[PDB]
Amino acid sequence: MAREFSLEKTRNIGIMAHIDAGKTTTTERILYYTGRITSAATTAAWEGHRVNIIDTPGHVDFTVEVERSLRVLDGAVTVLDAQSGVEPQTETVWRQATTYGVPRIVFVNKMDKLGANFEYSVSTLHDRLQANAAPIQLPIGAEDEFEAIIDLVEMKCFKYTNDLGTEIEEIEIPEDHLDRAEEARASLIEAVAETSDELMEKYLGDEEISVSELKEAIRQATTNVEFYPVLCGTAFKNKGVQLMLDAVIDYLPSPLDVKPIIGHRASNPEEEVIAKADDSAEFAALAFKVMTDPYVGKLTFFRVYSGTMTSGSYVKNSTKGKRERVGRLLQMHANSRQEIDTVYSGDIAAAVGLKDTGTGDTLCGEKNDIILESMEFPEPVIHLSVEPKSKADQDKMTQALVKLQEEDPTFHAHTDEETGQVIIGGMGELHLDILVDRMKKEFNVECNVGAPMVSYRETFKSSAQVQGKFSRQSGGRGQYGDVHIEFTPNETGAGFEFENAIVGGVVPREYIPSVEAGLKDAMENGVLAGYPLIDVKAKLYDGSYHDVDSSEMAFKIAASLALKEAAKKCDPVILEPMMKVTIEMPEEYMGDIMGDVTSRRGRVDGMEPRGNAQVVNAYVPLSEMFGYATSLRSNTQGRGTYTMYFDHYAEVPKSIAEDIIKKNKG
């Protein structure tokens, strides 16, 4: 009838880090520890506190999962490798969490690794991440020697006697480490003192900071995302894991502590409705994950921001504007999946039997009409031309793409009309690889990917006057038409500009529109390599007509003939789509980026020192740009980002153009 754990006790946390930082190991250990004495989120109990943990991937390709998790999470734990410290993807996940303003604590894992330097790791936090971080704990020894951790806040020591995380003997700080601990505690106070003016004055007064007093200030600072507590330990050797859990309860915010989400009323988008974490308030939940369990069926995970939900009820998806039958509510635990009857505010739960529900949707009561702000996912960085191996697969391919698009927001699929080609878009090579393989097996659709075909255009390089004449009196009815047109190269981007300079009505007014129509149709067809002719002006200066044989169709034919002869004299050239590329990277990799551009037949338009990452503006052929994402990340150590948008059509290099003609010919 009542929630077992109060809103205060609830702790929705997430684990984020670089690849192989030890997220899975940490989560597994956490679950074991909470459990003793899978899915999207697992519920756990620690010191009479509900801890809903979500493990997020480290790869840039799976940034989606980090993004969606952060939206529906209160706190987070950043795991770091002791040897390497902050790594490229740690920076990415940090910035993501900064956007959502998620309070975070740092755990320096792998203290047993060779080259492990806690101090170095802490330094990287300050330099690379430029964040107010300070150690709340100090390690005693490094690598193999590391066998003890110091609680600086309480000035205590814990001697781990084994790698089983049991029989830990709490002892007094070693006198040798005591001096170090004192200095560290001083620094800890100072950092939190910057956040807490009261604490600062207490520090300035040189009055011994109470352990409770300090903890309260640290809690506040962390919750305000102004200070970042730094912990240490080894998950593999079961050291510091328990202390981290304690710090989660002591520092990471509760659903109440976190700032309230404001949802725009559906009826009045202008109207803004703040949603507090009150169970009595109207129910409001956000679906963040949509998976299909093999046993129960489709499982939609959601986070109850406000109100309460009971199983066997009807709710309304404000986003979709449709009623949803909440038949069953499952809560995933460390081992088994238990069916809950009621979900309260600040709780993460999975609904079984929901239909037409996607990630980012606001599920609410029928009376309720609030729409909580949805999550923002990035745009594809890599595009590939997917296609089925067989025609039978094409049907299945369509269905597969739909489902995949629903499951993964960042995955996108579309069909380019010009090329008539379905193009898949993703956050990286690894991402699209996984998606393709899934189609091959799960969906059983054998597909082959490749470079997206590029649509080219043509234009006349020279200006020439040409006459087009038609005559057909061979069989019965005779048709005649004559037109003198001048095809002059038009300013790039201006487009077709037909000029009626007919004087004395040499061409009848009624036939003149048909002349243009004929040209347009002929220009739509290729004059060189079957590519639409663009950026050409046609001037109808002179012509002729035979009242009897004058037919609009004849003039249309005459117009086509004129364009043909123009091509023979106007030097038609192939044009390629050029894209403005905006690349942002640390100045260290600037030379490499510019080199890559000038290697891909690109030109640097200029540069600008936006923030701490120099932004380079450049124009590069679309065909050349294929595969820039991977190379960019290779050159920038996965610290580079780019955006490409079509700018203009430019002439293809004669050699490349020659190839295009050959290809289109056969």
Partner RNA sequence: AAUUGAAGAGUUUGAUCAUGGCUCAGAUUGAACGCUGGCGGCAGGCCUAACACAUGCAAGUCGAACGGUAACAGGAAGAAGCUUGCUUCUUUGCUGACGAGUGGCGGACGGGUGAGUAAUGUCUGGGAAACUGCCUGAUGGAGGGGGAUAACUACUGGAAACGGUAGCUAAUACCGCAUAACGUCGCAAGACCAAAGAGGGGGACCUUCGGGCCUCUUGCCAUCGGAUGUGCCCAGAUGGGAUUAGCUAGUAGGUGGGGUAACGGCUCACCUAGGCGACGAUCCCUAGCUGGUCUGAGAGGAUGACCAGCCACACUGGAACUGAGACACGGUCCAGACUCCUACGGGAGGCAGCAGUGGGGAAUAUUGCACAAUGGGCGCAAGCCUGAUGCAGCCAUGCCGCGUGUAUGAAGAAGCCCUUCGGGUUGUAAAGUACUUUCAGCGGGGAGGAAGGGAGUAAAGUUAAUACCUUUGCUCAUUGACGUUACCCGCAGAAGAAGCACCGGCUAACUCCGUGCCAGCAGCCGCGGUAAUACGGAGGGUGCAAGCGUUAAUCGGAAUUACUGGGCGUAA
* Rounded Cα–Cα distance for residues 429 and 436 (Å): 11
* Rounded Cα–Cα distance for residues 472 and 458 (Å): 31
Residue 353 assigned as binding residue: no
**Residues contacting 588, CB < 8 A, separation 6+:** none
* Rounded Cα–Cα distance for residues 8 and 104 (Å): 18
What is the 8-class DSSP label of residue 511?
A: G
Residue 393 assigned as binding residue: no
Q: Which residues does residue 458 pair with via DSSP β-bridges, in sequence order? A: 533, 574
Closest distance to Mg ion from the beta carbon of 21 (Å): 9
* Rounded Cα–Cα distance for residues 375 and 132 (Å): 27
Residue 341 assigned as binding residue: no
Binding positions for ligand GDP, 110-169, rule CB under 6 A: 110, 112-113
Residue 58 assigned as binding residue: yes
Is residue 201 packed enough to be buried (19+ CB in 10 Å), middle (13-18) or exposed (0-12)?
Answer: exposed
Cα angle 553, 555, 556; round to 5: 65
Binding positions for RNA, 338-367, rule CB under 7 A: 352-353
Residue 473 binds what, of Mg ion, RNA, ligand GDP, none (CB under 5 to 8 Å, by partner type)? Answer: none
H helix or E strand, kind and range, residue 644: strand 641-651
Is residue 80 packed enough to be buried (19+ CB in 10 Å), middle (13-18) or exposed (0-12)?
Answer: buried
For RNA, the closer of residues 299 and 427 by Cβ is: 299
Residue 24 assigned as binding residue: yes
Work out whether 62 is an interface residue with ligand FUA (CB under 6 A): yes
H helix or E strand, kind and range, residue 322: strand 322-326
Work out whether 484 is an interface residue with ligand GDP (CB under 6 A): no
- From 277-285, 428-436, 481-489, 516-524, give the range in contact with ligand FUA by CB under 6 A: 428-436
Q: Which amino acid is at 147?
A: E
Kindly compute the dihedral angle of the four CA atoms of residues 163, 166, 172, 173, in this order, to the nearest 10 degrees.
30
Q: According to CB under 6 A, which one of 10, 42, 43, 56 is a site residue for ligand FUA?
A: 56
For ligand GDP, the closer of residues 44 and 241 by Cβ is: 241
Q: According to CB under 7 A, which one of 24, 399, 617, 630 is a site residue for RNA?
A: 399
- From 55-63, 122-130, 277-285, 357-365, give the range in contact with ligand FUA by CB under 6 A: 55-63
Residue 296 binds what, of ligand FUA, Mg ion, RNA, none (CB under 5 to 8 Å, by partner type)? Answer: RNA
* Rounded Cα–Cα distance for residues 536 and 489 (Å): 5
Residue 59 binds what, of ligand FUA, ligand GDP, Mg ion, none (CB under 5 to 8 Å, by partner type)? Answer: ligand FUA
Q: Which residues does residue 331 pair with via DSSP β-bridges, in sequence order? A: 338
For ligand GDP, the closer of residues 146 and 628 by Cβ is: 146
Work out whether 38 is an interface residue with Mg ion (CB under 5 A): no
Work out whether 109 is an interface residue with ligand GDP (CB under 6 A): yes
The pair of three-digit structure tokens given for residue 56, joined into one six-digit string: 């997020």
Residue 62 binds what, of ligand FUA, ligand GDP, Mg ion, none (CB under 5 to 8 Å, by partner type)? Answer: ligand FUA
Residue 629 assigned as binding residue: no
* Rounded Cα–Cα distance for residues 161 and 176 (Å): 20
Work out whether 337 is an interface residue with RNA (CB under 7 A): no
**Residue ranges of the binding site for GTP:** 17-24, 55-59, 109-112
Q: Which positions lie near ligand FUA, rule CB under 6 A? A: 55-57, 59, 62, 64-65, 407-408, 430-431, 434-435, 438
Q: Which positions lie near Mg ion, rule CB under 5 A? A: 23-24
Q: Which positions lie near RNA, rule CB under 7 A? A: 292, 295-298, 311-312, 314, 323, 325, 327-328, 352-353, 399
